[PDB]
Enzyme design. Structure first.
Site, short mmCIF file in Angstrom:
data_model
loop_
_atom_site.label_atom_id
_atom_site.label_comp_id
_atom_site.label_asym_id
_atom_site.label_seq_id
_atom_site.Cartn_x
_atom_site.Cartn_y
_atom_site.Cartn_z
CE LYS A 143 27.49 -6.09 49.54
NZ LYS A 143 28.03 -5.35 48.38
CE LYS B 49 30.18 -3.77 52.99
NZ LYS B 49 28.84 -3.16 52.77
CD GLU C 69 26.30 6.48 44.73
OE1 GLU C 69 25.21 5.94 44.87
OE2 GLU C 69 26.65 7.00 43.65
#
Ligand SMILES: Cc1cc2nc3c(=O)[nH]c(=O)nc-3n(C[C@H](O)[C@H](O)[C@H](O)COP(=O)(O)O)c2cc1C
Ligand SMILES: Cc1cc2nc3c(=O)[nH]c(=O)nc-3n(C[C@H](O)[C@H](O)[C@H](O)COP(=O)(O)O)c2cc1C
Ligand SMILES: O=C(O)c1cccnc1
Ligand SMILES: O=C(O)c1cccnc1
EC number: 1.-.-.-
Lengths: 216, 216
Positions: free
Chosen positions: B13, B73, B164
């Site tokens: 994360k 990220k 995604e």
């Protein structure tokens, strides 16, 4: 080294029907299927692991007639895994995932739990209502699982072969998958290759990186 | 052991921006992308590997709007891979694969080579002409590659996260993918997690096998 494994693995063209997985290896292949990651941890999947000769025969029905080269592979191999995708995404399945996350102790509060469920609903609903792609999206996750699986089994030192050469309609009806809300996508016979595997001693072939890969 | 790896990897994360891939690791992750298997060895894929500040920024443009929490990220990771699928298949791509196989010495005669090309045409043509599913079918292969990749990087001892949650329309236009005949599917930042990765120290959660798995 996992690169060694990637560089040496191959699609097995023939398996030795007398070579079976150990009890422990059969545990390990199930562990791999279970612990594959998936979008939202949605896990939109069912696995049929055929290890009896009657079991493998039932799967091999899907290759009889047109996919008969796939038949030998399905029957010879120690274990045959049918990877199946959920056909529609039900709010029952989303609940069952978030309740599993909760049981495993992934959420510090009920605020954390409700927020995870809400996020999962948002993307899941986006696939079904907006993008009209929820079947496809669920199938993609199963293919991710397959990729994970093949490398995993190769790293265990086992031979395998991914098969799209089968009749999904036949295999579905053989296990009543349509009615349970699944559809078979890939069959993966797993075991030890025989001397008849011509592909075991052929060099690997891939397109060069200067075709497939841009560095920025 | 690969099961340890499967059981211990996690979706990162937060990454530590100071912790870069070694030059060797950067070669290894490229190797994994290239040597993924695929139906017919069709390899219907392109990769963007973003390792400069410039490059990661260009990718992070895709985490506008609803995908904002992806952004960190993509910028903080050492390397960010965009997995792309071919949009339709060209006969040129099938030729280039079989010519690659030939150059690598996989065929004993011209009879062997012509028969491989014709087999590849048969299933490929089935997808475009019959099932009208060739886009989807090529995308499925890319997701198999993602699955292979995530486990591979985890076996190298690297952190990663499949995303995604990004705007494929933005990323495509940023890299001119539509015109080159590709479309972005999954973004995978790779590197080392920071102490702020809350997911590094959470338990893994999966549905029990009595739900997901039938042994026959
Ligand atoms: C989704 C999928 C479907 C495949 N279907 C078949 C199949 O039906 N029969 C077969 O012999 N090989 C099948 N293959 C094996 C491929 O041809 C193989 O992965 C490719 O040629 C690369 O070779 P390798 O797996 O030995 O590295 C399939 C591969 C994938 C990924
Ligand atoms: C195709 C794919 C897409 C994902 N997209 C995201 C994403 O956009 N953001 C995110 O934080 N995690 C993303 N995840 C991570 C998943 O939530 C994670 O894989 C799943 O919860 C299982 O946890 P694990 O990867 O730690 O085992 C994605 C996973 C997959 C397989
Ligand atoms: O797994 C996730 O958290 C996820 C999946 C799809 C889109 N955004 C987030
Ligand atoms: O890769 C193969 O051998 C293959 C792929 C699809 C269908 N039949 C065979």
């Amino acid at each position: 080294d996992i690169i060694s494994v990637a560089l040496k693995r191959h699609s097995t063209k023939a398996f030795d029907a007398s070579k079976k997985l150990t009890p422990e290896q059969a545990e390990q292949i199930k562990t791999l299927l279970q612990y594959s990651p998936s979008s939202l941890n949605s896990q939109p999947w069912h696995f049929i692991v055929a290890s009896t000769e009657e079991g493998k025969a039932r799967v091999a029905k899907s290759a009889a007639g047109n996919y008969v080269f796939s038949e030998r592979k399905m029957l010879d191999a120690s274990h045959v895994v049918v990877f199946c995708a959920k056909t529609a995404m039900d709010d029952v399945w989303l609940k069952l995932v978030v309740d599993q996350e909760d049981a495993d102790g992934r959420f510090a509060t009920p605020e954390a739990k409700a927020a995870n469920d809400k996020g999962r609903k948002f993307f899941a609903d986006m696939h079904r209502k907006d993008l009209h792609d929820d079947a496809e999206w669920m199938a993609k996750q199963v293919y991710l699982n397959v990729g994970n699986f093949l490398l995993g089994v190769a790293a265990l030192g086992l031979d395998a072969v991914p098969i799209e050469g089968f009749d999904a309609a036949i295999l579905d009806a053989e296990f009543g998958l349509k009615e349970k809300g699944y559809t078979s996508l890939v069959v993966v016979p797993v075991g030890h290759h025989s001397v008849e595997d011509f592909n075991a001693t052929l060099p690997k072939s891939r397109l060069p990186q200067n075709i497939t890969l841009t560095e920025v």
